[PDB]
Amino acid sequence: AVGTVKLRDLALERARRANFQADQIIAKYAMGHGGLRPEAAGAVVFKV
Amino acid sequence: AVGTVKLRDLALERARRANFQADQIIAKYAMGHGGLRPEAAGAVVFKV
């Protein structure tokens, strides 16, 4: 297809902080995207 | 020739920190040391 590699998937956490007296909802998902198999890939462009 | 006072000894604990999203581990202790009855001590060293 094209590069997709996922570790930890998609997740989050609700954390509490003291000094500010408040909540922090934090979502993070680790991944990366390369590319491969140019054989099946191409593109169009208009210019001369 | 030397004592060590001991109060509350040593400990270890684990902690979560959301700011850098990194989790930390901390260990600690407290106590003093010092010379007493210098009568019984001394050393052996090279001359010059």
Pairwise CB contact (< 8 Å): A26 & B18: yes
DSSP secondary structure string, A5-38?
Answer: EEEEEEEEEEEEETTTTEEEEEEEEEEE-----G
In this structure, are residues A3 and A33 in contact, taking their beta carbons and an 8 Å threshold?
yes
Pairwise CB contact (< 8 Å): A26 & B16: no
Tell which residue, A42, A38, A45, has the closest CA to residue A1: A38
* CA angle (A31 as vertex; A29, A33 as ends), nearest 5: 145
Burial zone of A15 (CB within 10 Å; 0-12 exposed, 13-18 middle, 19+ buried): middle
Residue of B nearest to A28 (CA): B21
Neighbours of B34 (CB within 10 A): 8
Give the amino acid at A38.
P
Tell which residue, B26, B19, B13, B23, has the closest CA to residue A16: B19
In this structure, are residues B25 and B16 in contact, taking their beta carbons and an 8 Å threshold?
no
Tell which residue, A36, A42, A31, A28, has the closest CA to residue A4: A31
Is some CB atom of chain A closer than 8 A to the CB atom of B17? no
